[PDB]
Symmetry: C6
Subunit: 63 residues, 6 copies
């Protein structure tokens, strides 16, 4: 399983990520937390993103 | 695990939220209730939103 | 479970609803019936709507 | 399950239906066959439609 | 029960098909292979199409 | 199944692929890794792509 270690790295390293949604919208922030269905992306406020609506998670720099 | 405590906080605190749909539409209101598949968003009327159609849930202020 | 009591109320009360689809289209009618996957929306004819394509169900008045 | 008796009627009665897709596209023809995942819509040729891509099935007249 | 015989025919007969995606995009080629999640569509190269992203499979002539 | 051998080939051969997303976006890079839900596409950085958001995987040359 790749998803947990990948999201976990981005979390620990408080890396600025771009979460791209299935509709094309680009969300940005740091990954605050995550579970099986959602990812909490912190920014001005924490927003709960559903994984099912995420197409791709792009770190802003190598990890 | 994240989703339930997160939606639960927004509920108790009767916090104005913006639910963004996969189609880009922004719904607004307070979270009245929720289960495994839907979230009741109260406004002028209660509307049943399917989670599968939700991309992101954004509280209008920190919690 | 919120979905079943919610759709059930709209049914019994023969309330005019607007079913919004993931593509943005707004369907209208009364909820004739429903099961795990589809909702029968009566109008001129009964049309079978797949829940997976529904974003939000909006009653035309409080219930 | 409402889906099977509903599609079955449309089949037996060889009723002209409009299948609306999640992308907004309107397909037309008669329902030739169907199973748990797909519907064969006959027209000039039989096309296999995935139910997951169908938003709504609209008969061209009451049944 | 319909999907396998249908794709199997298109395969054996090496029939030019149009695979329409949920996003509207039209793919073309012959069905090289398929299992239960994805379809190999041969063209200039073989491309793996996810069935979940396919709305409709349209043969270019009757079968 | 064919997904695993197909992605595995593209991996071993470090073949430039185009992953097309359900939103129309074309991702490019080499397949670094993959599991049941996601594909790590290496580029400038590794990005985690959800398979559910992938429509088609197109190698840049035959394999």
């Amino acid at each position: 399983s790749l998803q947990d270690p990948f999201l976990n790295a981005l979390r620990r390293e408080r890396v600025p990520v771009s979460i791209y949604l299935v509709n094309g919208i680009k969300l940005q922030g740091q990954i605050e937390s995550f579970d099986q269905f959602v990812i909490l992306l912190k920014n001005t406020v924490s927003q709960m993103v559903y994984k099912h609506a995420i197409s791709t998670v792009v770190p802003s720099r190598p990890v």
